[PDB]
Amino acid sequence: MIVMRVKVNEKQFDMIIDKLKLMVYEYNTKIKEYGVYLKPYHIVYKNSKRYIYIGKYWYKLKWIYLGKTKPNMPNPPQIPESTIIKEDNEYIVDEKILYD
Amino acid sequence: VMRVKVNEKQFDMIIDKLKLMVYEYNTKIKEYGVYLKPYHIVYKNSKRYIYIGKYWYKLEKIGGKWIYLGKTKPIQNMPNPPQIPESTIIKEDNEYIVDEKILY
């Protein structure tokens, strides 16, 4: 396999997050039966970067993170694994401010 | 060659330098009820603008603050501010490396 990695802006990134909430929303209202929640991503601040992990990350009621596998539940829809990296923020400044 | 691109660490330094520029002034004009913030942060078409300049605020309570005043020294017999330059900093859009196939 060749897997490419490509750059998208914040608006595109919210797209990927928003769909992942959308495809688990109908399931997640179903899980009120067992009082657990499937959040389809996990955000990690390591190496002075936002890491934004895509996967099944399970929460139990201050919602505690049980882990990454089903704790007799109904089998959510499939989430890909993948890794999303925030680029460092960058600012357009006029030089004179750097010059002072 | 006026406009260049810097990262958060340098931009944080830029903000930090400005805050030190006004720190001693704000202690001196603490007693007038007045705070001089040397920048103003604006969310316009979903970018974070940071304008550099004199932005004056006053302390008042209503019920239970920091109401904006103006760009200019509110009281003629306060000590003069340090010279903030007027300039515009624009934060670029956040950018993400994504696995290709997650794009459907």
TrEMBL record, chain A:
For this entry, the protein name equals: Uncharacterized protein
Q: Which organism is it from?
A: Saccharolobus islandicus (strain REY15A) (Sulfolobus islandicus)
